[PDB]
Design a protein around this ligand. Structure first.
Ligand SMILES: [Cl-]
Ligand SMILES: [Cl-]
Ligand SMILES: [Cl-]
Ligand code: NA
Length: 129
C-alpha cells in the first residue's frame, strides 16, 4: 500500500506514534517519506546481507526475522513480512521499541540526514487531525 501523506499521519496518530518518545508526528511522517516513500511494501538489501522492511525500513539485523540474516536478532518478535502489510500496526509497534533503545530517531539514517533539524511540521500541515 502506498499511503498518502495525511492518511499515514492519521494512521500513525491512531497507533500512538504522535509525540512518542517526544517525537512529533511530523518527524514520523518525514522518516517514512524518505525511508519508503510511504510504501508499505518497500524492501532494501543492506551490504551486510540484512534487509530493511516496510514504511520505516526496519532492519532484519536486529528487529525482525526473515530467515536469511545469519547471527541476527528478532527483537520485535515478528516475521519481517509482517512489516510489509497494508496495516501499519506491526511497523508502528516495532518502531516504538526501536526509538526507545537509547538513540531516539537517529536509528533511522534517512531521518537524521533529511528530517532532523528541519521544519517537520510541514509533513502534517493541512491534515485533518
Ligand atoms: Cl535469520
Ligand atoms: Cl493502518
Ligand atoms: Cl530522543
Ligand atoms: Na533477524
Amino acid at each position: 500500500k502506498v499511503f498518502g501523506r495525511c492518511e499515514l499521519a492519521a494512521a500513525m496518530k491512531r497507533h500512538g506514534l504522535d509525540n512518542y518518545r517526544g517525537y512529533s508526528l511530523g518527524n514520523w511522517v518525514c522518516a517514512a517519506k524518505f525511508e519508503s516513500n510511504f510504501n508499505t511494501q518497500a524492501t532494501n538489501r543492506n551490504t551486510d546481507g540484512s534487509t530493511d522492511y516496510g514504511i520505516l525500513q526496519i532492519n532484519s539485523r536486529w528487529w525482525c526475522n526473515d530467515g536469511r540474516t545469519p547471527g541476527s536478532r528478532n527483537l520485535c518478535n515478528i516475521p519481517c513480512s509482517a512489516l510489509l502489510s497494508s496495516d501499519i500496526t506491526a511497523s508502528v509497534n516495532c518502531a516504538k521499541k526501536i526509538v526507545s533503545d537509547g538513540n531516539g530517531m537517529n536509528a533511522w539514517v534517512a531521518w537524521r540526514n533529511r528530517c532532523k533539524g528541519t521544519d517537520v511540521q510541514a509533513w502534517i500541515r493541512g491534515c485533518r487531525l
